[PDB]
Amino acid sequence: PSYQGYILESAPVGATISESLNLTTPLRIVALELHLFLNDYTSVFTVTPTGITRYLTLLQPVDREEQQTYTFLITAFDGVQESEPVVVNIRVMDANDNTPTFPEISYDVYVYTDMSPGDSVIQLTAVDADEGSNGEISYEILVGGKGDFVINKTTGLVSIAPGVELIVGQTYALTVQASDNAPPAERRHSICTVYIEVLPPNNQSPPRFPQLMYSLEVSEAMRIGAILLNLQATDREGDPITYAIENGDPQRVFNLSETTGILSLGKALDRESTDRYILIVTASDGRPDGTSTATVNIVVTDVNDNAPVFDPYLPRNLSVVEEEANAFVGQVRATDPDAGINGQVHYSLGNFNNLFRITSNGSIYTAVKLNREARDHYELVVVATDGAVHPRHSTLTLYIKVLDI
Template sequence: MDGGNPAKSGTSKITVNVLDVNDNVPLFENTFYKVAVQENSSNGSFVIQTKATDIDEGPNGEIEYSLGKHTPPTVLSLFHIDAVTGDIYLKKELDHETQASYRIDVSAKDKGFPKMEAHCSVQVDVLDVNDNPPDIVLTLIPTALPEDSRSGTVVALLSVRDLDSGDNGKVTLKLPKSSPFNLKPSFSNNYALVTSGALDRESFSEYNIEITATDSGSPPLSSKKIIPVSISDVNDNAPIFTQPSYNVYLKENGVPGSILYSVSASDLDFGENAKVSYSILVSKVQDVSVSSYVYINSDNGSIYSMHSN
């Protein structure tokens, strides 16, 4: 406005542009994310998306994602984050049996100066897949079992384990129906292999007991273990002659010491229990001991005359 009379005035429009300063920290939509991933997910599989925003403009509002600087090497070897989208991917397959859960620190930084940074936490739970068959472990190795062992005699001790969890790790054991053995549970997946009936070495001198372990997964996985059990002999069989009686006809005036006849017997037992020794029972003929007429070779059953008839 001027100082004349009348006064004259003029107007001007002034536009004020407010320049952005990097004064806002990026903000995650969630400070905590949780996701479950199956352990057999392939390399490169998508896991989860993290998302942050920054209300600043230009580079001050542009966000770059990364895993936190204190992320352990095990996590870095398994997970990768897209710097632009915040998507997390698998770098290699997970293993529930190695680690069932991971906690990942995610960083979101803007591109202003100085950079502003925010963090969120991602929990990745690894879901079990039935990828481990049961394992049967012998804790007491069987020794030779006497054939007269009573029913319920402990033959071997074993344990069964399955690295999977839940139903995938529940295991049942099975024996062949014809087996004279049973599995008796003791405690916490431990079992005793015991006899369930009479044994006879002469019928079966050795058993190869096949134990099948099957888990409850879908589909179920199974494994087998063969336990050899040898049956040791007990002297439970009498020698048997080749015939119940022998009729021998001799010429008179035979030469003393000549062989008259040979008898033979066998024994179903084994080793020393099967060795047969021959002898003549004490008896008399016309009040004279039979042993004064003949003698028998104790090793081979050959009968010889003692003098002329």
């Protein structure tokens, strides 16, 4: 048979003895009316005179400066029967005098994106001077960590929450609370405010490009030294920026300024040959980690810089019958290295245009019954014309010899 009670040293006369340390619930003795008598301390504690369940009460106020631990014996009596004795033990627990209080009301602290989950943010420590458990401090983060931060219930260290990977330029206002492990009704707490901002690693970044890829058009005709493109990379921290081409131009046909980032042209372009460059460019602090990249797609565009050339080995000596019209003389063929309208060839005749004609393709014909005796030798000149505005020509004299039978 064994009872354990608890009473607070500030408790009034006429107070029930409790069962938990929490002091929320009262002590509960069974009466199996009957007479429960108690042997010691009868001047401070009294039993409930009636009821199946019975309570202990304060007669005189207690104080634990002397006498923190009463132990005595309930027994029930009835004349007929004296009971076996029940042991009651009580503890007079100390009042909560002190609020756990932080040194500072607020805290300012930085966080860097490179720091992982579990990496520590800020140790902070309230101090509750009350001896025992009226000063065992517990720390909770109430709100405003967005669950990216978590504190240690007992140590007071805020570290990074599981699997977060913090984004830059992100602020926070955590509100932490220190509370003592005292009983509920007599328990103190104080709150505190951690303002957090997220920086980049080492508070440093590379110089960034306003875009990752650049889609250019250039005319093969564009001058040497004429600027293609300014590569305006801003650096957050104000570091000086060094640009350089890294891939895509083994010829140094292009010149990117080391300091200004302007990309001029260094050698003459020809599209006939190579019609597209794709460089890689870089801007950087110097700081080993601090460096960005970017890809620039030069596509060179066409100008009519090429006359249509006749195929070298065309038969030049031709023959057509004595006397006929729409009679096939022979065929020519010309090509143009340019592109578009500048590539298209159109065939024309530079003389004898009432005698002979020519089709859209190379096919030369007679328009009229040619006369074997009036004429035998025609040095005729055929003209290939490219299809541009401001077109270019080539000519080719053929030697037609008209026949008979």
